[PDB]
Amino acid sequence: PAGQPERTLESLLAHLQEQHGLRVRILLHGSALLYAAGWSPEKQAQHLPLRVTELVQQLTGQAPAPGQRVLVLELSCEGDDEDTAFPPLHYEL
C-alpha cells in the first residue's frame, strides 16, 4: 500500500475545492476517466460518496486483484502553463 488510505471521492473533490480553492482535475489512465469538469454540475461530482479507488475501477468495470498493483493517473487540466498543474500521480493497490 502506497500513499495515504483511500477515504472517499466526495472528500477528495470537496477537499481540493474548499481547502485549496482550486478547480478540480480529471484523473484518467486506461481504466477510466474521473469526473471533475464538464457539462454536469460540479456539486454532483463532489456528491459521489464512492471511494476514490473503488469508484475509478467500478466505472471501469474491473474488480480488484490480489497482491500489489501498479497504476498511474494523468492530470488533465486547462491552463496557460504546464507547471500550474501537478505531475502524474503514482498510486499502487
Curated annotation (Swiss-Prot):
Q: In which tissues is it expressed?
A: Expressed in a variety of normal and tumor cell types, but is reduced in lung cancer cell lines.
Q: Subcellular location, in the record's words?
A: Cytoplasm; Nucleus
PTM comment: the record says: ISGylated.
What switches on expression, per the entry, is described as: By DNA damage. Upon interferon-alpha exposure.
Record's function text: E1-activating enzyme that catalyzes the covalent conjugation of the ubiquitin-like protein product of ISG15 to additional interferon stimulated proteins (ISGs) as well as other cellular proteins such as P53 in a process termed protein ISGylation. Plays an essential role in antiviral immunity together with ISG15 by restricting the replication of many viruses including rabies virus, influenza virus, sindbis virus, rotavirus or human cytomegalovirus.
What is annotated about its quaternary structure and interactions? (Microbial infection) Interacts with human cytomegalovirus proteins NEC2/UL50 and UL26; these interactions inhibit ISGylation and cause proteasomal degradation of UBA7. (Microbial infection) Interacts with rotavirus non-structural protein 5 (NSP5); this interaction promotes UBA7 proteasomal degradation.
Question: What family name appears in the similarity comment?
Answer: Belongs to the ubiquitin-activating E1 family.
Q: What is this protein called?
A: Ubiquitin-like modifier-activating enzyme 7
Name the encoding gene, please: UBA7
